[PDB]
Amino acid sequence: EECMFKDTRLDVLPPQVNPLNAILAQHTAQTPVHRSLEKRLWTEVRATAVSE
Amino acid sequence: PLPNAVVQGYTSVRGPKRPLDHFYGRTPLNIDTLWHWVKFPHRYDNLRFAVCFWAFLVSAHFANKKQR
Amino acid sequence: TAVVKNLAKLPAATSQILTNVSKLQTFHGLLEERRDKYAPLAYHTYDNLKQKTTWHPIAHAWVDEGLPVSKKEYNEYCWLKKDMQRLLPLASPFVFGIYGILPLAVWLSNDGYLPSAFSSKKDIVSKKLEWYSSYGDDLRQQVGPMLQHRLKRHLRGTLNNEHRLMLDEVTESYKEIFYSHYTGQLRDVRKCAHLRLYDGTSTVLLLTNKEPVELTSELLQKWNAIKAAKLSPEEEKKARNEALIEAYKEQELHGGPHVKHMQGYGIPADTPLLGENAKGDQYTQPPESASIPLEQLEWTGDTVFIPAEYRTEMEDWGRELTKLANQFLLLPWRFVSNAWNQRRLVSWFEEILQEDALIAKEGGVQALSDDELKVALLDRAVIRCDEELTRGDMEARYKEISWLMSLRNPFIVLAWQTGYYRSTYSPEDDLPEASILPKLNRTVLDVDVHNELAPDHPEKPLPRVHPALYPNSHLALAKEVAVLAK
Amino acid sequence: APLYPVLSQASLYKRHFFKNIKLFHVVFYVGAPCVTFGTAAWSGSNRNSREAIFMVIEERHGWDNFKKLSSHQQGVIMQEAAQESLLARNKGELHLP
Amino acid sequence: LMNGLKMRMFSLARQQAPKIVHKPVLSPIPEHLRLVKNVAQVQIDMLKLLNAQAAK
Amino acid sequence: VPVANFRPKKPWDGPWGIQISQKKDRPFIAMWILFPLLLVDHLTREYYAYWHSSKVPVTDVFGDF
Amino acid sequence: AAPAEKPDPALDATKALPKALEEVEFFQSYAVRRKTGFHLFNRATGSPTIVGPMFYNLYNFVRIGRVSKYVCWLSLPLVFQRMWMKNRATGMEYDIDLENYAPFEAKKNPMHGH
Numbered sequence: 043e044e045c046m047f048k049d050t051r052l053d054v055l056p057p058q059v060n061p062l063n064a065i066l067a068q069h070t071a072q073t074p075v076h077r078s079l080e081k082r083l084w085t086e087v088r089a090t091a092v093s094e
Numbered sequence: 095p096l097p098n099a100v101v102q103g104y105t106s107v108r109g110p111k112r113p114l115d116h117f118y119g120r121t122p123l124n125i126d127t128l129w130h131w132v133k134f135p136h137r138y139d140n141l142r143f144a145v146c147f148w149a150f151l152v153s154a155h156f157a158n159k160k161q162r
Numbered sequence: 163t164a165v166v167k168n169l170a171k172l173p174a175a176t177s178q179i180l181t182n183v184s185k186l187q188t189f190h191g192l193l194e195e196r197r198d199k200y201a202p203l204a205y206h207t208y209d210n211l212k213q214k215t216t217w218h219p220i221a222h223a224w225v226d227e228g229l230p231v232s233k234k235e236y237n238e239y240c241w242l243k244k245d246m247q248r249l250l251p252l253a254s255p256f257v258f259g260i261y262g263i264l265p266l267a268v269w270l271s272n273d274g275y276l277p278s279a280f281s282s283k284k285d286i287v288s289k290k291l292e293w294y295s296s297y298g299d300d301l302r303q304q305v306g307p308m309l310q311h312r313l314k315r316h317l318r319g320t321l322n323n324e325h326r327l328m329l330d331e332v333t334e335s336y337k338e339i340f341y342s343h344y345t346g347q348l349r350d351v352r353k354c355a356h357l358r359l360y361d362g363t364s365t366v367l368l369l370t371n372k373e374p375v376e377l378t379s380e381l382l383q384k385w386n387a388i389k390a391a392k393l394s395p396e397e398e399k400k401a402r403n404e405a406l407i408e409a410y411k412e413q414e415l416h417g418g419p420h421v422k423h424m425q426g427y428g429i430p431a432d433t434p435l436l437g438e439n440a441k442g443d444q445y446t447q448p449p450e451s452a453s454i455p456l457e458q459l460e461w462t463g464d465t466v467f468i469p470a471e472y473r474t475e476m477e478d479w480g481r482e483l484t485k486l487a488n489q490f491l492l493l494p495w496r497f498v499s500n501a502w503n504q505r506r507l508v509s510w511f512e513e514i515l516q517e518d519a520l521i522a523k524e525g526g527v528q529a530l531s532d533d534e535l536k537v538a539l540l541d542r543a544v545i546r547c548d549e550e551l552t553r554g555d556m557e558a559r560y561k562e563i564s565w566l567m568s569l570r571n572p573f574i575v576l577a578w579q580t581g582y583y584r585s586t587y588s589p590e591d592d593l594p595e596a597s598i599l600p601k602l603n604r605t606v607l608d609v610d611v612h613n614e615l616a617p618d619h620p621e622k623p624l625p626r627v628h629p630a631l632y633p634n635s636h637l638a639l640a641k642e643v644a645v646l647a648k
Numbered sequence: 649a650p651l652y653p654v655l656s657q658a659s660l661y662k663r664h665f666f667k668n669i670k671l672f673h674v675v676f677y678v679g680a681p682c683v684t685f686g687t688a689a690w691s692g693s694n695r696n697s698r699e700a701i702f703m704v705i706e707e708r709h710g711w712d713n714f715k716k717l718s719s720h721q722q723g724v725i726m727q728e729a730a731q732e733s734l735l736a737r738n739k740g741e742l743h744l745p
Numbered sequence: 746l747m748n749g750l751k752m753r754m755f756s757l758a759r760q761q762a763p764k765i766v767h768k769p770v771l772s773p774i775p776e777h778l779r780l781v782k783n784v785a786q787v788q789i790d791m792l793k794l795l796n797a798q799a800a801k
Numbered sequence: 802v803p804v805a806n807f808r809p810k811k812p813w814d815g816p817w818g819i820q821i822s823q824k825k826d827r828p829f830i831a832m833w834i835l836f837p838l839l840l841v842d843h844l845t846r847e848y849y850a851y852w853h854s855s856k857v858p859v860t861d862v863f864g865d866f
Numbered sequence: 867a868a869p870a871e872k873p874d875p876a877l878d879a880t881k882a883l884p885k886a887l888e889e890v891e892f893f894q895s896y897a898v899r900r901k902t903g904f905h906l907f908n909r910a911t912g913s914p915t916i917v918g919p920m921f922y923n924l925y926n927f928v929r930i931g932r933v934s935k936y937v938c939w940l941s942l943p944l945v946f947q948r949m950w951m952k953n954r955a956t957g958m959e960y961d962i963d964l965e966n967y968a969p970f971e972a973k974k975n976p977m978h979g980h
């Protein structure tokens with residue numbers, strides 16, 4: 043009843059959770075493993091492309 | 095007889111009341127703070143006695159003359 | 163003053179008025195000729211109390227995808243319809259008498275009360291922008307906040323009954339949509355779509371020769387595939403009916419359509435047999451279509467849209483909220499039932515959707531000019547003329563409200579729109595101080611429409627993730643990238 | 649730099665006298681003169697004794713003749729009438745219908 | 746407090762000006778700005794290191 | 802560049818707050834003038850009919866008589 | 867239909883009687899009086915009266931008033947006016963002829979109507 047006569051903003055703060063983790067986890071769960079290993083090839087070939 | 099909301103003055107949340115202003119550096123001016131400016135008559139009491147006497151006397155004079 | 167200034171051009175205005183009427187007649191002839199052969203019959207429906215018609219865009223707002231018309235010509239059509247509405251005070255002398263000229267003087271005083279013919283400008287875009295910046299933005303900037311309050315107080319209800327009416331999952335989205343003028347942060351449109359959680363599930367029953375079947379994403383996908391294959395009708399109808407019987411079996415396994423167990427709607431069971439008509443244990447009398455075998459299941463071509471808007475429906479809005487919704491959109495509102503204002507709002511909705519379609523045909527938003535985009539956003543009621551935004555912010559705003567209007571719900575549309583008309587005035591001259599940061603800029607990429615967003619839990623809001631940070635975003639955003647880089 | 653018509657301190661000091669009233673400050677302060685000089689005590693007694701007085705007068709003496717007499721004899725007859733009415737010898741000394 | 750008595754003493758003096766008490770106001774704006782500062786410094790160190798790598 | 806969601810006041814923004822306060826305390830001011838007027842209207846009143854009255858005060862509203 | 871609302875304590879009745887008793891206790895607190903100058907005529911039995919020991923409270927509140935304590939007594943002389951006029955009227959000599967011709971509020975007087 044005395045909510046107006048308090049300062050409870052510290053008792054209720056916005057969480058520091060990154061929602062991106064929930065997104066990337068759903069991304070890996072849907073993909074297979076050989077595509078995960080392929081991404082290491084896509085990155086490596088991109089490095090050699092920038093090198094040449 | 096009555097619910098607690100009516101007694102405490104609120105259904106769910108007690109709302110803050112704006113406090114009363116004071117006007118620092120001067121006397122409060124309210125219906126009950128007027129004796130600071132207007133005391134009972136004390137300056138012309140003896141003149142009141144004199145004027146009451148003279149009013150009674152002059153009224154009696156002219157009334158008696160009219161009646162007679 | 164403006165009275166004599168407009169009387170000076172009143173002779174020169176009648177010719178333009180009649181020319182505009184002819185243009186309107188020709189365009190309406192074309193549009194109705196197309197509509198009378200390509201558009202379905204949206205039947206009239208009465209409200210729950212069954213005294214006045216009710217209107218929804220899903221059934222009544224049809225979009226002629228394939229209208230051979232330029233966007234500017236449609237703008238002319240709509241603007242001249244509004245001019246015909248504004249020509250109504252000319253009837254005052256013909257119903258009141260020769261003394262019915264003072265209303266005509268009041269009409270001629272303000273230029274915002276007048277049609278296009280009294281304007282010195284020529285291009286429809288410049289004319290529309292002049293009218294807006296002179297009269298319409300000001301008229302709209304004084305209805306926005308009050309409309310927002312009415313929408314809020316429609317959701318939360320009156321007399322301290324929020325614990326009985328509001329939902330605890332739409333709470334943070336409600337706050338971000340309605341109280342972001344406190345924070346100064348931008349809004350995500352998906353948080354306005356979360357307001358639809360107050361409503362039920364919107365369904366679509368296709369009517370067959372046997373029973374109604376609920377439409378699903380799978381059945382719709384199959385029908386679109388069959389439509390794209392361009393097969394013969396002997397094969398097209400066969401595949402459609404195959405998908406239809408499959409969906410019928412699927413919903414019969416689900417436990418019937420969603421509508422059977424929703425308050426206010428329902429499918430009757432088999433009729434009962436009364437008294438001696440009861441033949442022992444068979445207390446029912448099935449319909450005629452029970453004789454038809456299920457393999458002959460064919461779509462009747464008839465559809466029933468059920469929005470299930472238990473809190474959002476325009477009927478329960480009221481005498482005042484409807485009028486303010488029409489005021490805020492610069493539509494006619496006075497001295498009419500809420501049904502007529504509902505139709506006016508739905509017609510505005512249809513106009514905006516057709517304009518969106520024509521814009522997408524013309525090459526999107528980027529093909530438009532700056533004044534044309536400004537005028538489009540003014541028509542959508544998301545910009546006020548005292549802002550001076552960038553082009554990217556305008557494009558993002560258009561994309562936002564276009565997606566929001568694709569959902570066919572006026573309440574969330576108005577909730578979104580009214581947020582862009584919450585401006586304050588300071589009591590001091592020095593404050594607000596001159597800012598140090600640059601003007602707000604955005605892009606079409608910053609708007610997340612291609613992803614779903616769950617409602618944030620009450621008092622546990624989450625930060626905003628850019629679409630670019632998602633995996634494979636460069637592949638999903640490739641269209642916008644190609645449009646912007648070019 | 650206030651853009652509004654800023655109100656002086658003394659004007660607020662004076663308006664506070666008018667808006668800082670409580671309910672009892674009106675009720676009792678206006679009820680005391682009202683209850684004393686009202687339809688109950690003084691004004692009522694006066695104005696309702698006058699009716700009986702002039703009824704008695706017009707029945708016994710007459711209003712025109714009463715008007716012709718002096719203020720003294722007028723008051724004498726008025727007092728006699730007031731006594732006759734207060735007594736209520738015919739009502740068994742009871743001011744009831 | 747006295748032997749066999751307790752009392753409440755009130756002064757009698759006009760208050761010419763209000764009495765001030767330092768009640769510090771909690772606000773998130775300074776911490777917002779400090780968080781912005783820290784994140785920007787992170788990105789600045791990142792850019793400097795990446796430039797050193799790309800050029801060296 | 803200025804700060805957003807801020808603008809100068811306009812006629813349709815209504816009066817300022819101090820003006821609304823001045824509107825509010827007008828009944829409270831007229832109270833002091835009207836309660837004495839109420840008491841004076843009751844105290845300075847005379848009845849309109851007596852047992853002897855051959856006439857009663859009449860007030861022609863529209864002067865038709 | 868089946869809303870399942872929790873009990874609201876504001877709808878209970880557990881403060882009205884305490885508040886009224888608090889008001890009555892504040893009233894009775896002003897009845898506290900010193901021993902000096904105390905006198906109260908008890909009944910003939912020696913037991914106290916009812917109104918007697920609850921006059922100090924009332925007059926201690928009259929002390930705190932501002933306008934009523936100087937105005938509400940001005941209707942009291944009127945009581946003595948009645949006390950005197952009634953006795954004047956109990957034995958007032960009157961004319962038999964006027965009483966028989968114009969009796970005040972007597973029944974069956976056709977000039978009144980009945």
Ligand SMILES: CCCCCCCCCCCCCCCC(=O)OC[C@H](COP(=O)(O)O)OC(=O)CCCCCCCCCCCCCCC
Binds near residue numbers: 840
């Ligand atoms: C034998 C006669 C009776 C006994 C002797 C005389 C009486 C002695 C007692 C003292 C005098 C009593 C006066 C009696 C007058 C009377 O008859 O009272 C009745 C008369 C009306 O009678 P009529 O209408 O019949 O003439 O009213 C007045 O006299 C007017 C008095 C004005 C009082 C105002 C008080 C204001 C107090 C401040 C309050 C402020 C709060 C805000 C409110 C505005």
Ligand SMILES: CCCCCCCCCCCCO[C@@H]1O[C@H](CO)[C@@H](O[C@H]2O[C@H](CO)[C@@H](O)[C@H](O)[C@H]2O)[C@H](O)[C@H]1O
Binds near residue numbers: 095096100101102103
């Ligand atoms: C006893 C037999 C059964 C009958 C029971 C009901 C009797 C009702 C009559 C007594 C009414 C008393 O009415 C009393 O009014 C005051 C107004 O000052 C209310 O007072 C309330 O409102 C005010 C403001 O208006 C608030 O600031 C306050 O906190 C709150 O108490 C009381 O809550 C109520 O109790």
Ligand SMILES: COCCOCCOCCOc1ccc(C(C)(C)CC(C)(C)C)cc1
Binds near residue numbers: 671675
């Ligand atoms: C059994 O009860 C008998 C008491 O009743 C006395 C009737 O009093 C009439 C009104 O009295 C008041 C005066 C002021 C108030 C307050 C102080 C609560 C007024 C307020 C709310 C403005 C502060 C309440 C009642």
Ligand SMILES: COCCOCCOCCOc1ccc(C(C)(C)CC(C)(C)C)cc1
Binds near residue numbers: 889890894897920923
């Ligand atoms: C608004 O509500 C307040 C109304 O309260 C009125 C209460 O009235 C009763 C007060 O009367 C009394 C009764 C008893 C007493 C005293 C006699 C308590 C008893 C004592 C002093 C002998 C202990 C004093 C005053």
